[PDB]
């Protein structure tokens, strides 16, 4: 529409809107950014390399007083879509990522209300490091965290806030290997820094143990059950060595396979 | 399933007298993260239970 393009040209006019500048008013006031993580898919947990891969939608909300207009002057328009690469953004990234990918994947449009409110819900595929506990494998429970920070602005320039105290599962596809237990979020400060602020989510996930039960535990139990038979085998039959050496070989091979499944950490031994 | 047994079954105490209720489990209920997840609830007649204590060292607001 002619009115819509007039409005979009007016809003993003580089002569009077610089996207490099924080939308700060009242001097030393700070920009408040609301964050909310929605989980769409838990793509995989890789125990060996200790990485979790997720598909998430990262809701980010703030107010930019410079992106305001009067609806009566623009055909009564209440909100418009703007390209997120042409407006100021809080550079909120995943700090504990693996693969060195901090930003979101797509950079969708931002919805902008006439009063300056900005809604931005870009999708992302994230790979995050997490500490894998091997002790109770394959009946283990994992605790993998996702730390979100701004890598441009500190606590004196923006404030990160949680829209909700848990992550959203409204559009979640179940995994089939991992069961979701809890997804709490917390806002952390540093009493000795005063410029540090992050929002962390704890992903508490519980392995469904049937697959590894069937494929590892039962074969292991079956092999172990043979360990006693050597002492009931008569010495005349001439087969004791065959049996005991075969059992030892099978146990060692299973130990090596397990060692190849779990991460090669030394903080604990799987039971 | 873990079994919780509460003693005494009844506790008579006049107003202003300290009360003590003992709660024992079938086995340990400790967790790796360094917390024990035990909780206390009260149910006045005709009303749904209410939360009093969680993570016993803590207290619900």
């Amino acid at each position, epitope marked *: 529409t002619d009115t819509e393009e007039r409005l979009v040209e007016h809003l993003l006019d580089p002569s009077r809107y610089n996207k490099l500048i924080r939308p700060a008013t009242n001097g030393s006031e700070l920009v408040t950014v609301q964050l909310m993580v929605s989980l769409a898919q838990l793509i995989s947990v890789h125990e060996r390399e200790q990485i979790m891969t997720t598909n998430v939608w990262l809701t980010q909300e703030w107010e930019d007083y410079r992106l305001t207009w009067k609806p009566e002057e623009f055909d009564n328009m209440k909100k418009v879509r703007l390209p997120s690469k042409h407006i100021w953004l809080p550079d909120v990234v995943l700090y504990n990522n693996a693969d060195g990918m901090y930003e979101v994947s797509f950079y969708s449009n931002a919805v902008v209300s006439y009063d300056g409110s900005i809604f931005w819900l870009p999708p992302a595929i994230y790979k995050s490091a997490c500490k894998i506990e091997v002790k109770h494998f394959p009946f283990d429970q994992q605790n993998c965290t996702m730390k979100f920070r701004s890598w441009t602005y500190d606590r004196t320039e923006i404030d990160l806030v949680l829209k909700s105290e848990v992550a959203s*599962l409204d559009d979640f596809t179940p995994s089939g290997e991992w*069961d979701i237990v809890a997804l709490p979020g917390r806002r952390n400060e540093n009493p000795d820094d005063s410029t540090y602020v992050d929002i962390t989510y704890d992903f508490i996930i519980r392995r469904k143990p049937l697959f590894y039960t069937i494929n590892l535990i039962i074969p292991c139990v079956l092999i172990t059950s043979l360990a006693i038979l050597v002492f009931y085998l008569p010495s005349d039959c001439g087969e004791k060595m065959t049996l005991c050496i075969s059992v030892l070989l099978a146990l060692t091979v299973f130990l090596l396979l397990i060692s190849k499944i779990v991460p090669p950490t030394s903080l604990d031994v799987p039971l | 399933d873990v079994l919780m047994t509460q003693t005494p079954l009844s506790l008579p105490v006049s107003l202003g007298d300290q009360a003590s209720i003992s709660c024992r489990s079938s086995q340990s209920i400790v967790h790796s993260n360094g917390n024990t997840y035990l909780e206390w609830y009260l149910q006045k007649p005709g009303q749904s239970p209410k939360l009093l204590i969680y993570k016993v060292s803590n207290r619900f607001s």
Partner: nanobody, 112 residues
């Protein structure tokens, strides 16, 4: 936040009943819903739980097969279906919010 439970139900032995719990004012899909049974004599017995966001459910030993949980994400409601009913099943049933290992079950339904 508020959890709203359906009304009272009177059924014949061997019939089937379905109770509902509707949660509002919070992220309904991200909280487990706990179902509790309280026979008129005494005792709070937990039937099980369901996480609306996924389909995951857990049942106690005594209620396996007896109770089935389901959840509707569109209308923020969770349903418990009870199997063939007996006079032993007459009680008051509660629905409550819960997030394991964190802030825990601080809100309950009025009871059915």
């Amino acid at each position: 936040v508020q959890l709203q439970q359906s009304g009272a139900e009177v059924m014949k032995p061997g019939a089937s009943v379905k109770i509902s719990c509707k949660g509002t004012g919070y992220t309904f899909s991200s909280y487990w819903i706990e179902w509790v049974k309280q026979r008129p004599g005494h005792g709070l017995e937990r039937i099980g739980e369901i996480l609306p966001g996924s389909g995951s459910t857990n049942y106690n030993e005594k209620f396996r097969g007896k109770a089935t949980f389901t959840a509707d994400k569109s209308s923020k409601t969770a349903y418990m279906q009870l199997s063939s009913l007996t006079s032993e099943d007459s009680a008051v049933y509660y629905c409550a919010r819960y997030l394991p290992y964190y802030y825990a079950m601080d809100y309950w339904g009025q009871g059915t």
